[PDB]
Amino acid sequence: TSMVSMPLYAVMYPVFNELERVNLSAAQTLRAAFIKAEKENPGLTQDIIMKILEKKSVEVNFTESLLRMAADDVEEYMIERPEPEFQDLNEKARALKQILSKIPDEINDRVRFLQTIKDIASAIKELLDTVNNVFKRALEHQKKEFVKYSKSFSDTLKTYFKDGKAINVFVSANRLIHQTNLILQTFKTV
Amino acid sequence: TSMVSMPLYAVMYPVFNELERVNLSAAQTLRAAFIKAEKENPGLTQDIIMKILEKKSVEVNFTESLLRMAADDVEEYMIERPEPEFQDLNEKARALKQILSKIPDEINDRVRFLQTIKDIASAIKELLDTVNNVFKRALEHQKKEFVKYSKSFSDTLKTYFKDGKAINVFVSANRLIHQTNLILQTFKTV
Amino acid sequence: EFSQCLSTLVRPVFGELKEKHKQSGGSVGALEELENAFSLAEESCPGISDKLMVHLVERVQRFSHN
Amino acid sequence: EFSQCLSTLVRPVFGELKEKHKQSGGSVGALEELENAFSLAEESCPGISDKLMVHLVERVQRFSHN
């Protein structure tokens, strides 16, 4: 399935998946309509969510919460192929996303944050090795993009340790997560 | 020229027009690139403006300021035809936009606000008469749209007099202004 | 019989957003199709929109902290 | 010789927005063309970007109140 914006697949997709049990047809309809409307007007889903939370008086920092929600698997980007390499790709992608999502819970404590950063580095190189291993075109381009976002995330870490703005780190981590999902989706659709 | 988003034509277009004297070529380049980028990603201009003001520590309520800035003519939507009916169309459109832009300066004082509302009604019916007179297709549709936005603006006034939220009035007035500009642009491009 | 959120949440929010994109991007057909998709879903299964809102709020609250 | 705002304003803002739209809408070519258009304008006429910023701020300030 197509690559969509993070609010859609990280916030709404699980909601659609849960509505499956209630009524499959209605869930599929809502899902498809959401995808189409998001495609027509990018950022629609985020605005819908924000205005809904606003009207229900639910106060949150949406980028941080998005970072936490982005940990979950996106079923449509998961490779169904049984071969070990692809399942390993799913696993490494998942690991990186999971460790990146731990940032908001850890960033205030310097020690635990540094440990988290170490784990992030480890996950990144693991996913890199797996990606380069699977190579048996656009794939290489997505790999280079992934590396670029990794580097950018590191620079963001430096800048944070300079000025102390957490939001930039959250945004960068979200970017890296999205690029990971993009890697998997690209591998899946070729 | 094409119909663009309000931040572009109400904030940036005059800036481009003023840069004409400094260097015509550069101004035209910036203008065209802005139009194209806005077309590629709707809402780009507003974000550019907002982030610029943010970085320069200029604190404003952007919708209100936008309402005030939307009073100015959009040269590309002005009919150049010398016939009295079209120039009258330009005049009535301008009058309605000018009176709608007075709302932020008047809304806090009930008396002056009511007077402003009266003047708004007058301008609306004048523009309506002029539009219906000029009819010598899509034009009729745009006319109906204009009437719809007028009615919606009235409802917004009622709701304001109920709860006292000025921002809704500002947004509605902006919508009506945009529809006025749309009327003129539609008349110009057929 | 139907969900409460249809009039209290879906309608005003989608109205605001419809006006937001109609006077910028230009295309609002799919947006309206989504708003209507809430209605079709409600007709296929009464209460499912409310359940959608509940699941949304549950999800954002589970992954929000301080 | 050139404008100050090229590095202090244009570059970071357009970076943020580029990442904002690249991972949503998908098309960022025209955005980058605009960022570059600032550079071409600067090359055609040194200082014109600063003048653009000045005119922008002047305009928003003239029509802002309390």
From Swiss-Prot, chains A, B:
Keywords, ordered alphabetically: Acetylation, Angiogenesis, Apoptosis, Cell membrane, Cytoplasm, Golgi apparatus, Isopeptide bond, Membrane, Ubl conjugation
Tissue: Ubiquitous.
Consequence the record notes for mutating A121D: Loss of interaction with CCM2
Pfam families reported in the protein's UniProt record: PDC10_C, PDCD10_N
N6-acetyllysine modification, residue list: K158
Transmembrane segments: none
A single MF term (Gene Ontology): protein kinase binding
Gene Ontology biological-process annotations: angiogenesis; cellular response to leukemia inhibitory factor; endothelium development; establishment of Golgi localization; Golgi reassembly; intracellular signal transduction; intrinsic apoptotic signaling pathway in response to hydrogen peroxide; negative regulation of apoptotic process
Covalent cross-link (Glycyl lysine isopeptide (Lys-Gly) (interchain with G-Cter in SUMO2)), residues: K165
GO CC term (a single one): cytoplasm
Main location: cytoplasm
Keyword Acetylation found: yes
Coiled coil: none
Location(s), subcellular: Cytoplasm; Golgi apparatus membrane; Cell membrane
Membrane topology type: Peripheral membrane protein
Disulfide bonds: none
InterPro entries: PDC10_dimerisation_sf, PDCD10, PDCD10_N
Self-association state and partner proteins as the record states: Homodimer. Interacts (via C-terminus) with CCM2. Interacts (via C-terminus) with PXN. Interacts (via N-terminus) with STK25. Interacts (via N-terminus) with STK26. Interacts (via N-terminus) with STK24. Interacts with GOLGA2. Identified in a complex with KRIT1 and CCM2. Interacts with KDR/VEGFR2. Interaction with KDR/VEGFR2 is enhanced by stimulation with VEGFA. Interacts with RIPOR1 (via C-terminus); this interaction is required for the association of RIPOR1 with either STK24 and STK26 kinases and occurs in a Rho-independent manner.
Record's disease association: Cerebral cavernous malformations 3: A form of cerebral cavernous malformations, a congenital vascular anomaly of the central nervous system that can result in hemorrhagic stroke, seizures, recurrent headaches, and focal neurologic deficits. The lesions are characterized by grossly enlarged blood vessels consisting of a single layer of endothelium and without any intervening neural tissue, ranging in diameter from a few millimeters to several centimeters. CCM3 inheritance is autosomal dominant.
Role according to the record: Promotes cell proliferation. Modulates apoptotic pathways. Increases mitogen-activated protein kinase activity and STK26 activity. Important for cell migration, and for normal structure and assembly of the Golgi complex. Part of the striatin-interacting phosphatase and kinase (STRIPAK) complexes. STRIPAK complexes have critical roles in protein (de)phosphorylation and are regulators of multiple signaling pathways including Hippo, MAPK, nuclear receptor and cytoskeleton remodeling.
The family this protein is said to belong to: Belongs to the PDCD10 family.
Protein name: Programmed cell death protein 10
Organism annotation: Homo sapiens (Human)
Taxonomic lineage of the native organism: Eukaryota, Metazoa, Chordata, Craniata, Vertebrata
Swiss-Prot record, chains C, D:
Tissue: Ubiquitously expressed. Highest levels are found in testis, large intestine, brain and stomach followed by heart and lung.
Subcellular location: Cytoplasm; Golgi apparatus
Superkingdom classification of source: Eukaryota
Disulfide bond positions: none
Subunit composition and interactions: Homodimer. Interacts with CTTNBP2NL. Part of the core of STRIPAK complexes composed of PP2A catalytic and scaffolding subunits, the striatins (PP2A regulatory subunits), the striatin-associated proteins MOB4, STRIP1 and STRIP2, PDCD10 and members of the STE20 kinases, such as STK24 and STK26. Interacts with TAOK3 (via N-terminus); the interaction promotes STK25 abundance at the level of protein expression and/or stability.
Family, per entry: Belongs to the protein kinase superfamily. STE Ser/Thr protein kinase family. STE20 subfamily.
Summary of the function given for this chain in its UniProt record: Oxidant stress-activated serine/threonine kinase that may play a role in the response to environmental stress. Targets to the Golgi apparatus where it appears to regulate protein transport events, cell adhesion, and polarity complexes important for cell migration. Part of the striatin-interacting phosphatase and kinase (STRIPAK) complexes. STRIPAK complexes have critical roles in protein (de)phosphorylation and are regulators of multiple signaling pathways including Hippo, MAPK, nuclear receptor and cytoskeleton remodeling.
Record-given protein name: Serine/threonine-protein kinase 25
Taxonomic source organism: Homo sapiens (Human)
Residues of the full protein shown: 355 to 418 of 426
